Amino acid sequence: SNLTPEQQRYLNAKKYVKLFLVADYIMYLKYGRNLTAVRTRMYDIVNVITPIYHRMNIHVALVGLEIWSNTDKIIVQSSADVTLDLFAKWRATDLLSRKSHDNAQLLTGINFNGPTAGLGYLGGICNTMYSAGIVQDHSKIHHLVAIAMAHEMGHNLGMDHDKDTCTCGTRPCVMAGALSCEASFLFSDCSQKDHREFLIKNMPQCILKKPLKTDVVSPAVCGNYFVEVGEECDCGSPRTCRDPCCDATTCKLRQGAQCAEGLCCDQCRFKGAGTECRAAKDECDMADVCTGRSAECTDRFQRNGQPCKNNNGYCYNGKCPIMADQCIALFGPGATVSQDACFQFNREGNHYGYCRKEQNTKIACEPQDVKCGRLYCFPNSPENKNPCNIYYSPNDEDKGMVLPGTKCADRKACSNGQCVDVTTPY
Amino acid sequence: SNLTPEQQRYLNAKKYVKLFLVADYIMYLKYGRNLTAVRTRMYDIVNVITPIYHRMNIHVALVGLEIWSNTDKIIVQSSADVTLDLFAKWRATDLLSRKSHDNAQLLTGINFNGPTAGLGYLGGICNTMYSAGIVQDHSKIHHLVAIAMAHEMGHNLGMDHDKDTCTCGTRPCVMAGALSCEASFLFSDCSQKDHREFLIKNMPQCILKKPLKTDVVSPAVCGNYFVEVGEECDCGSPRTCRDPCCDATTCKLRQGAQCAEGLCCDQCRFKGAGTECRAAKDECDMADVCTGRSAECTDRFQRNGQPCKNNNGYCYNGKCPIMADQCIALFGPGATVSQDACFQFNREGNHYGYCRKEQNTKIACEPQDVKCGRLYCFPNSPENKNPCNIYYSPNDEDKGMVLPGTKCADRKACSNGQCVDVTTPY
Numbered sequence A, B: 001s002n003l004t005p006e007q008q009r010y011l012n013a014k015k016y017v018k019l020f021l022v023a024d025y026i027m028y029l030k031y032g033r034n035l036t037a038v039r040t041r042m043y044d045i046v047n048v049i050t051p052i053y054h055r056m057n058i059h060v061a062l063v064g065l066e067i068w069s070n071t072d073k074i075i076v077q078s079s080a081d082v083t084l085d086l087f088a089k090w091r092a093t094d095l096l097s098r099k100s101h102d103n104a105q106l107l108t109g110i111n112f113n114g115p116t117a118g119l120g121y122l123g124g125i126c127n128t129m130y131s132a133g134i135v136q137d138h139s140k141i142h143h144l145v146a147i148a149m150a151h152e153m154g155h156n157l158g159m160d161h162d163k164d165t166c167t168c169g170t171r172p173c174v175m176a177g178a179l180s181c182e183a184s185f186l187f188s189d190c191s192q193k194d195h196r197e198f199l200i201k202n203m204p205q206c207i208l209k210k211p212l213k214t215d216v217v218s219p220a221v222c223g224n225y226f227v228e229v230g231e232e233c234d235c236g237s238p239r240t241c242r243d244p245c246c247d248a249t250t251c252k253l254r255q256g257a258q259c260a261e262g263l264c265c266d267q268c269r270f271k272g273a274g275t276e277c278r279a280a281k282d283e284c285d286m287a288d289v290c291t292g293r294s295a296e297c298t299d300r301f302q303r304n305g306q307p308c309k310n311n312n313g314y315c316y317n318g319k320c321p322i323m324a325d326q327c328i329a330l331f332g333p334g335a336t337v338s339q340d341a342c343f344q345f346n347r348e349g350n351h352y353g354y355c356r357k358e359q360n361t362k363i364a365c366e367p368q369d370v371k372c373g374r375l376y377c378f379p380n381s382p383e384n385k386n387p388c389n390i391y392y393s394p395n396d397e398d399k400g401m402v403l404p405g406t407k408c409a410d411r412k413a414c415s416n417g418q419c420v421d422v423t424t425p426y
């Protein structure tokens, strides 16, 4: 109730963690230079992690797998801390450059200094440079290694270590700071909360996108609640399965049934074509309709240029980019758009003030394209004595620039560093 | 059901296990190419083993450590069975030829196929071809890796897996078929009995020899029940120590104490000079007496020459070496000394028949020193057609020759490939 319609809508949204596992050189050697063995080892670990996170309304999906059999791609060392750091960086510049994934975990055969069996950036989930974690293949029992991985992933998802009071049952919980073969596959009531609050406050977007059945590289497992290649539906085990449209025993649709789950499926039958499946959430969202011959129901948004937010902007691919909200995202609450005069600094085409970067140079904004270059904000505070303040980033000079589609005038929005009319398909 | 003098005598003897550990290349990489780390690992493991086996009157002592930091000497595969064989043969071939030890254990970071976490020949202790075992550094907790090694060594000591009727408390025992991370460091009642029986019906001699304090390659540890360099005594950990003569904390004798161990040590004091500390086992043995100013009991014997074995041999360093028994030792029962004529082949000076080596050459025997070269025996098998038979080891050529002090002529014995008189100090 206290949660915005979006927050509640976010929490209710099923979660997916497109995971990308990585086995290091020692893992390859550890398993007799047998890629099949290493690969299988990982698959199993996943078969333990998946059912664990189901109780968190999160489906871990192995969308990728890499075994450094020819040689490691990062200086994996006894220092769990350094290893994590190097792994994350590699993951940010190398891996993410060729394979899109929500989180990556490193399974190494090396032995980290001290009792630590893994590390994972707290809340780093979805984050390009922090949604990672490392785990030592510390025990022969893969069930224990999986828990270790779930632990690290637990951190990535905002969860902390269980404190004395925290409980999940009569045995230790995944987030217990110390392992043991008496460890369960349950998260303490604390973890449950920490996670929830984390989600509410951050709402990491990436964990919302469901991977394609083909994106999953893990051997299809019937009963894991996820329809994988070769399966028609997955409602879990015959005992837990609650969908009459599916045969939990073989993961196949039952005679007559055309679909099992989905917004466009009622009583095991494709909803009539034209029937609405998803209503409009905002003034830029367009109610979705069922094709009638499919089980899914793609999402569509209003046509760009559609006035939104009391005529303060124009819809852009479902969103309503306002120059005001952008300042609040760059500097925080209370932040406001600097007066017009400020944007005139874009006509200088200097290091920060510009509109477009054709090749690598900087083109000064045209007198009528100023509000499309660098965004000048002003934190509405009785302290700040500067009306014009920009948000620069040495790494990305685009960061801090007026987002595309941002209303730069009446019936106009920024396309490519220029204030153009919103009456033209953009 | 009864126990023979030699058996009881053997049982009472303090047992020692000069262990040699070997780490594979993966172990090297598994610990960041840090020899200190790998050594420390092996050291910690021995620290857990020692106390376990002491309860068995067995003092484990690390007399050798070899880390294959450059390359493995054998092809360590995921097949435990094949690795055990390769290692067992390597030891019998390369290792034993470089350093003497009672038993070797291969600690590898490789993962064995299936649940197997180690392997070790049954009752192969002291055997040059079977006193070996392979252990997987499967867990991060060296405690479980120690129990694993203790388990394999257990087999080497004639111990077998525990039956559901065997116990050692509430926790599972070392020789438990399944390795629980809650496993204790105790041996089941069955384990202890099989061991006793094994020792009685075998009496592996190598474990009777105590390792010189200078042979222990492992760092001195006050509490390892072994008086190493810089220690006056070692009653184990200060917590378990029960010896009223030793300061378990400093491994120093307490005030008013002259000793803590020794046949000539009683109640922390030296037994008075003259006191008997050992009876004569055979006819070539002389009762031993305490000096009064020492805790040890030197085992003196009869002067070499004393008639023994019903006048078939002459005492030699506490033993009565006679060809009669030698043949039986080399070719089993029924084997008897061949007829004089045979020994003539020793004059041959050829490949096998000789009396002694200079360096690479062999000084053939002479008409009299003939019966002091290669021992000639013959099987009593009716199907036998050869009177002169020989035992020859291409590995060690000395093997098969007549034993020193062995009664050759009448009142003479073999000294150095020569039949010298027994009256002369040989």
Ligand SMILES: *[C@@H]1O[C@H](CO)[C@@H](O[C@@H]2O[C@H](CO)[C@@H](O)[C@H](O)[C@H]2NC(C)=O)[C@H](O)[C@H]1NC(C)=O
Pocket (backbone or CB within 6 Å): A032, A034, A036, A037, A038, A040
């Ligand atoms: C690589 O590892 C795989 C297993 O991880 C080995 O294949 C297994 O072989 C056994 C028979 O000994 C089968 O019972 C298993 O089902 C197989 N595992 C599966 C499902 O692949 C394979 O032999 C190893 N490679 C080699 C030849 O060393």
Ligand SMILES: *[C@@H]1O[C@H](CO)[C@@H](O[C@@H]2O[C@H](CO)[C@@H](O)[C@H](O)[C@H]2NC(C)=O)[C@H](O)[C@H]1NC(C)=O
Pocket (backbone or CB within 6 Å): A078, B034, B036, B037, B038, B040
């Ligand atoms: C090589 O391995 C040894 C471990 O045997 C490391 O030494 C340890 O260093 C830590 C400090 O980080 C101490 O707390 C431990 O007590 C040390 N172990 C012992 C007993 O030596 C050493 O730092 C490693 N070297 C490298 C390059 O990492």
Ligand SMILES: CNC(=O)[C@H](Cc1c[nH]c2ccccc12)NC(=O)[C@@H](CC(=O)NO)CC(C)C
Pocket (backbone or CB within 6 Å): A115, A116, A117, A118, A119, A120, A138, A147, A148, A149, A151, A152, A155, A174, A175, A176, A177, A178, A179, A180, B140
């Ligand atoms: C197998 N090793 C373990 O169980 C050690 C135990 C431990 C860590 N710190 C300690 C301080 C005192 C006593 C024991 C420990 N803990 C770990 O590996 C945990 C480390 C962690 O919290 N990583 O984020 C991750 C694990 C939960 C998978």
Ligand SMILES: CNC(=O)[C@H](Cc1c[nH]c2ccccc12)NC(=O)[C@@H](CC(=O)NO)CC(C)C
Pocket (backbone or CB within 6 Å): A140, B115, B116, B117, B118, B119, B120, B147, B148, B149, B151, B152, B155, B174, B175, B176, B177, B178, B179, B180
């Ligand atoms: C960590 N894995 C284990 O505990 C497995 C369990 C196991 C062996 N055989 C089985 C058959 C069916 C199911 C499980 C097993 N056992 C071992 O590693 C034991 C193997 C052995 O007997 N070595 O001599 C050595 C061990 C005591 C250290």
Ligand SMILES: [Ca+2]
Pocket (backbone or CB within 6 Å): A220, A221, A222, A223, A224, A225, A226, A227, A228, A231, A234, A251
């Ligand atoms: Ca499935």
Ligand SMILES: [Ca+2]
Pocket (backbone or CB within 6 Å): A278, A279, A280, A285, A286, A287, A288, A298, A299, A300, A301
């Ligand atoms: Ca829609």
Ligand SMILES: [Ca+2]
Pocket (backbone or CB within 6 Å): B220, B221, B222, B223, B224, B225, B226, B227, B228, B231, B234, B251
């Ligand atoms: Ca000691």
Ligand SMILES: [Ca+2]
Pocket (backbone or CB within 6 Å): B278, B279, B280, B285, B286, B287, B288, B298, B299, B300, B301
């Ligand atoms: Ca004596």
Ligand SMILES: [Co+3]
Pocket (backbone or CB within 6 Å): B059, B225
């Ligand atoms: Co003792």
Ligand SMILES: [Zn+2]
Pocket (backbone or CB within 6 Å): A151, A155, A161, A177
């Ligand atoms: Zn943690």
Ligand SMILES: [Zn+2]
Pocket (backbone or CB within 6 Å): B151, B152, B155, B161
């Ligand atoms: Zn066994």
